[PDB]
Amino acid sequence: TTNHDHHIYVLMGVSGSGKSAVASEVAHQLHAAFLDGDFLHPRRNIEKMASGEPLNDDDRKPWLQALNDAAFAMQRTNKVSLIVCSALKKHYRDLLREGNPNLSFIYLKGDFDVIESRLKARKGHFFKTQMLVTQFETLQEPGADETDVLVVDIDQPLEGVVASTIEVIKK
Amino acid sequence: TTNHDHHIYVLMGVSGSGKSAVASEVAHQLHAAFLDGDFLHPRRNIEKMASGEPLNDDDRKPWLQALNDAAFAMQRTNKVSLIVCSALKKHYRDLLREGNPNLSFIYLKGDFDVIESRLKARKGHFFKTQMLVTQFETLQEPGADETDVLVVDIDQPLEGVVASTIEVIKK
Ligand SMILES: [Cl-]
Ligand SMILES: [Cl-]
Ligand SMILES: [Cl-]
């Protein structure tokens, strides 16, 4: 079940890498559909993330399944769809690919120090530093074997990350 | 859990009222979070619709519950969130409201004729008569008892609808 004329790009990478900011702007510029995956977290998950407890594979399963289904729904009527999903592990990405051969990834990439230096916080907010440590540890960067992954350098201003993402989509 | 300083606006109305086009632009202009609820339809709903059949309460229930959790997720970190959901019956609206006192509705309101011509304005669009008839049959316009409903007149250019929506949100 796929419309092969249409395509889905999952913007992945650790929390704090600016995925939503980028996806939002890219989709608006390209007149593409956009979905922030963070919003499909099941109730249980939301409660857990806020109380500070990092999620586990089983917690993410239903979330990834929901995202798989949302991707499918989006590609039915949109030539281009962007979904934000950290998609840190390889089989999370595999879960997203199931039944979605027209889905690929755009990995907003940088090392811990790059990410930390590019972090954009709201006035008065404390950045979840130890969350970034954990996320960076969890991250399994897509190896050459993962052929549907395109990479973007987050070590630049938002406007530059947005144009680079666009170029990769136009590629 | 619920942040009373944050808010969710559900853009509602019959298929064809231009909900997604308005919400997307409003959200972009206001830098708000935006979720097109149509992407959260369970696959079964997707297929039933793709077979030419209107959905019913039973089919919509799980969709609405997913939307209820999505709204909850959105208002955690966003001051303003927009969700597209036809939300045609009062009880559907009450399901979205459950546990979301900071959720309200924006009814993109127009009569059959206004919507038919809006749809036909798009070059090459085939107008589905009976689909629109069924939608209006299903529609239960929010009465005075629903105090969290703002109304916008969709008998104007998209630009004007967006402006009126923003105005209803800012007032
Ligand atoms: Cl992010
Ligand atoms: Cl619509
Ligand atoms: Cl139609």
Q: What is the 3-state secondary structure (H, E, C) of chain A?
A: CCCCCCEEEEEECCCCCCHHHHHHHHHHHHCCEEEEHHHHCCHHHHHHHHCCCCCCHHHHHHHHHHHHHHHHHHHHHCCEEEEECCCCCHHHHHHHHCCCCCEEEEEEECCHHHHHHHCCCCCCCCCCHHHHHHHHHHCCCCCCCCCCEEEEECCCCHHHHHHHHHHHHHC
Distance of CA B98 to the CA centre of its chain: 17
Closest-lying ligand to the alpha carbon of B125? 3
Nearest chain A residue to B45, by CA = A73
The amino acid at residue A78 is N
| Half-sphere exposure at residue B44, Cβ-oriented, CA atoms within 13 angstroms | 8
Contact assessment for residue A164 and residue A152, using Cβ atoms and an 8 Å cutoff = yes
List, in sequence order, the alpha helices (H) in chain B: 19-30, 43-50, 57-77, 90-97, 112-120, 129-138, 158-170
Other beta carbons within 10 angstroms of residue B117's beta carbon come to 12
Q: Please give the distance, rounded to the nearest whole angstrom, from the Cα atom of residue B162 to the centre of ligand 1.
A: 28
Q: Please give the distance, rounded to the nearest whole angstrom, from the Cα atom of residue B68 to the centre of ligand 1.
A: 23
Q: Please give the distance, rounded to the nearest whole angstrom, from the Cα atom of residue A20 to the centre of ligand 2.
A: 24
Dihedral over Cα of A97, A102, A107, A108: its sign:
negative
The secondary structure of residue B34, as a DSSP letter, is E
Taking the CA of residue A136 and the nearest CA in chain B, the distance in Å comes to: 22
* Residue A18, annotated as binding a ligand: yes
Cα(B51)–Cα(A130) distance, rounded to whole angstroms? 49
Question: Which technique was used to obtain these atomic coordinates?
Answer: X-ray
Dihedral over Cα of B153, B156, B158, B160: its sign:
negative
Nearest chain B residue to A38, by CA = B73
Cα(A55)–Cα(A67) distance, rounded to whole angstroms? 16
Contact assessment for residue B33 and residue B131, using Cβ atoms and an 8 Å cutoff = no
Q: At B165, is the secondary structure helix, strand, or coil?
A: helix
Residue whose token pair is 């798989």 = A68
- Edge to edge, what strands does the sheet with B149-153 contain? B33-36, B80-84, B7-12, B103-109, B149-153
Q: What are phi and psi of B64, to 5 degrees?
A: -60, -40
Q: At B120, is the secondary structure helix, strand, or coil?
A: helix
Contact assessment for residue B118 and residue B110, using Cβ atoms and an 8 Å cutoff = yes
> Which of these, A110, A108, A79, lies nearest to A168 by C-alpha position?
A108
Cα(A145)–Cα(A142) distance, rounded to whole angstroms? 7
Other beta carbons within 10 angstroms of residue A116's beta carbon come to 15
> What resolution (Å)?
2.0
Q: What is the CA radius of gyration of chain B?
A: 15
Q: At B8, is the secondary structure helix, strand, or coil?
A: strand
A61 touching B (Cβ < 8 Å): no
What contacts B28, CB < 8 A, 6 or more positions away? A24, A28, B34
Cα(A64)–Cα(A57) distance, rounded to whole angstroms? 10
Q: What is the CA radius of gyration of chain A?
A: 15
Q: Please give the distance, rounded to the nearest whole angstrom, from the Cα atom of residue A7 to the centre of ligand 1.
A: 22
Cα(B112)–Cα(B118) distance, rounded to whole angstroms? 10
Q: At B170, is the secondary structure helix, strand, or coil?
A: helix
Q: Which CATH number fits domain A1-171: 3.30.420.40, 2.60.15.10, 3.40.50.300, 3.60.21.10?
A: 3.40.50.300
Q: Which residues of B touch A41 (CB under 8 A)?
A: 69, 73
Annotated binding site of B for ATP: 13-20
Q: Do A39 and B1 touch (CB under 8 A)?
A: no
The secondary structure of residue B85, as a DSSP letter, is -
Q: Where are the domains of chain A?
A: 1-171
Cα(A142)–Cα(B132) distance, rounded to whole angstroms? 46
The amino acid at residue B82 is L
> Which of these, A132, A169, A120, A125, lies nearest to A148 by C-alpha position?
A169
Cα(A81)–Cα(A75) distance, rounded to whole angstroms? 7
Residue B117: C-alpha distances to residues A140, B52, B151, B156 (Å)? 51, 22, 20, 11
H/E stretch holding B38 reads: none
**Using N-to-C axis directions, what is the helix angle for B19-30 and B158-170, rounded to 10°?**
60
